[PDB]
Amino acid sequence: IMSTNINLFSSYQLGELELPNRIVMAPLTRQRAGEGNVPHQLNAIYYGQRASAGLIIAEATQVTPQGQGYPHTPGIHSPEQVAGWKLVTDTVHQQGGRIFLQLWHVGRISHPDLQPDGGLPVAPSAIAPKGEVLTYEGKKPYVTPRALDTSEIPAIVEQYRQGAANALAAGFDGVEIHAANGYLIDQFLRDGTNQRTDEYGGAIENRARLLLEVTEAITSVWDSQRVGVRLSPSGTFNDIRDSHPLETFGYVAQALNRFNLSYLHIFEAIDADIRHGGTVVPTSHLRDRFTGTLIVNGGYTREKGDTVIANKAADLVAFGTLFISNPDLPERLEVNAPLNQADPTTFYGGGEKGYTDYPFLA
Ligand SMILES: Cc1cc2nc3c(=O)[nH]c(=O)nc-3n(C[C@H](O)[C@H](O)[C@H](O)COP(=O)(O)O)c2cc1C
Ligand SMILES: [Ca+2]
Ligand SMILES: [Ca+2]
Numbered sequence: 001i002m003s004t005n006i007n008l009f010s011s012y013q014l015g016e017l018e019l020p021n022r023i024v025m026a027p028l029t030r031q032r033a034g035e036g037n038v039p040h041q042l043n044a045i046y047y048g049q050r051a052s053a054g055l056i057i058a059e060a061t062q063v064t065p066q067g068q069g070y071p072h073t074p075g076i077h078s079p080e081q082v083a084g085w086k087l088v089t090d091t092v093h094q095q096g097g098r099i100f101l102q103l104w105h106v107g108r109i110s111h112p113d114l115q116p117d118g119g120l121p122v123a124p125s126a127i128a129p130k131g132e133v134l135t136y137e138g139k140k141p142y143v144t145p146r147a148l149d150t151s152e153i154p155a156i157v158e159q160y161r162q163g164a165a166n167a168l169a170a171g172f173d174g175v176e177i178h179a180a181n182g183y184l185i186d187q188f189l190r191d192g193t194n195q196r197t198d199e200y201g202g203a204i205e206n207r208a209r210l211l212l213e214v215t216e217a218i219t220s221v222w223d224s225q226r227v228g229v230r231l232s233p234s235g236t237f238n239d240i241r242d243s244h245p246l247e248t249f250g251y252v253a254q255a256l257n258r259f260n261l262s263y264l265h266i267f268e269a270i271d272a273d274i275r276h277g278g279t280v281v282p283t284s285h286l287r288d289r290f291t292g293t294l295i296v297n298g299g300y301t302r303e304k305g306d307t308v309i310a311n312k313a314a315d316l317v318a319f320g321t322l323f324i325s326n327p328d329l330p331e332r333l334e335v336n337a338p339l340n341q342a343d344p345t346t347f348y349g350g351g352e353k354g355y356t357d358y359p360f361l362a
Contacts, residue, residue: 008305008317009334012054014293015225015262017098017173019054019316022309023330026297026320027057027102027176027230031349033074037062039084043074044091045356049327051097057176057228057265057318058088060104060183063163065116067184069106071136072349076101076163082170089171100174100228100262101167103160103218107184108145108193109238111135120146122156124187124194124201124210129239150198153210156184161217164227174226177214180267182238185211186231189252190242204251211252215259228262228295233281234269245279253289264290265318268298287313302333328360337361 004010012019034040047056061076062068068075075081085101092099108123113135115121123145132139148156160177167175179185187193188210194201200209211229218227233249242248256264269280287294296308297318305317323329325342332339346354 005310007309008302009330010309012293012316014055014316015223017055017226019098020052021054021330022305022316023054023333024295024297024316024318025050025053025056025323025329026318027059027178028320028324029059029070029073029348030355031070031072032351032355033072034084036078036080037068037073037075038078038080039074039088041087042352042356043084044088047088047099048091048095048097049356049360050323050329051092051095052328052330053097053323054316054330056092056097056099058099058101058172060102060178061085061163062104062106064105064159066110066119066122067105067107067159068114069110069121069133069183070348071114071134073104076103076166076170077159082166085167085170085172089173093171098173100176100226101170101172102176102178102230103163103167104178105156105159105184107187108142109133109183110145111140112143113137113140120144122146122148122152123184124148124196127193127195129182131239147196150200153200153213156210157213157217160214161221164218164221168221174228174262175218175222176228176230176265177211177218178230179211180230180232181235182232182240185214186240189248190240191248192241192243204248207248208252208255212255215256215261219259219261224260225262227259228265229256230265230267231286232267233286234273234278235267236273236276236278241278245281246285249281250285250289253286257289257291261292263293263295263316265295266297268296270298284313302336305333325358327358332361 110121
């Protein structure tokens with residue numbers, strides 16, 4: 001096969017997976033799980049509708065009950081949940097698509113009202129996040145999470161591993177480790193949330209240890225090239241920050257090479273991050289260190305996407321917002337068609353409205 005100019009619509013070889021284009025559907029929490037946090041027919045339709053994506057990353061999905069921080073997010077810990085997700089993966093596959101499950105644990109970003117037996121959210125350190133959390137009794141302030149004991153860490157790792165094994169049984173093509181957006185793995189990574197004094201805190205190699213041990217466990221379940229990791233090096237979402245972001249995420253980028261992963265997925269800096277002035281980590285910093293497939297994300301367009309692909313800054317481009325509103329986003333981007341405008345009042349929770357009722361092209 002001859003040399004060609006690559007763009008958003010070029011095929012890609014993601015391990016054994018043949019991606020029809022470079023367009024990825026970002027993971028998107030929609031809070032529309034059914035009873036017992038089990039996916040159902042409506043969720044299958046939703047993902048099925050978007051199967052023209054080169055790859056779908058499914059919404060954040062908790063690997064364990066303690067890992068839930070928002071009502072009606074799906075889980076991947078129970079047989080009923082596995083059955084539910086199988087319905088989703090079958091539908092995506094019948095539609096000729098590919099889908100990875102994003103494996104979740106919210107850590108301190110939860111509330112006792114959402115925890116089993118009203119227990120405490122767990123975290124690297126007993127540090128209460130600022131602001132409020134939505135519970136069934138309206139908005140309540142966060143409480144101080146419970147700091148995990150050192151000998152509790154193998155249990156967390158087992159929770160991810162079991163979650164990944166369940167995703168495998170549920171027919172997914174791969175998994176993405178949610179190490180971003182201020183949730184549990186991210187909480188351990190960054191020193192604003194991690195003030196431990198054992199082998200999981202302090203020096204960067206310690207702060208990275210949970211992520212690396214979780215990654216190792218999951219590659220004992222999946223072929224490593226079906227395992228991805230998502231980071232948000234510049235994000236402050238959920239009251240998280242790191243004193244030396246370049247050092248921290250630079251180290252992680254390099255350390256992940258030994259695992260021969262499917263990809264590294266970067267949620268890039270939003271305007272809020274620059275304007276409130278945390279150190280912005282350039283994606284090029286991570287591109288120079290992680291040697292495998294790189295997915296970039298955050299406010300991308302057809303033009304910005306072609307740009308990063310053509311100039312080799314990234315290999316895949318994930319879209320979030322635009323996939324909510326445009327189920328056939330790849331087709332529309334290709335022909336420069338008009339795009340449906342997303343309705344943020346229906347991003348979270350509810351039913352088919354603002355979920356499955358966005359119209360296909362023409
Ligand atoms: C409604 C909504 C739900 C999201 N859910 C997740 C999620 O479950 N896991 C995750 O890593 N990121 C999640 N994100 C962040 C997006 O995946 C993405 O990085 C962000 O929307 C920026 O991409 P975009 O500009 O293309 O929308 C969510 C974003 C939105 C708006
Ligand atoms: Ca193949
Ligand atoms: Ca290098």
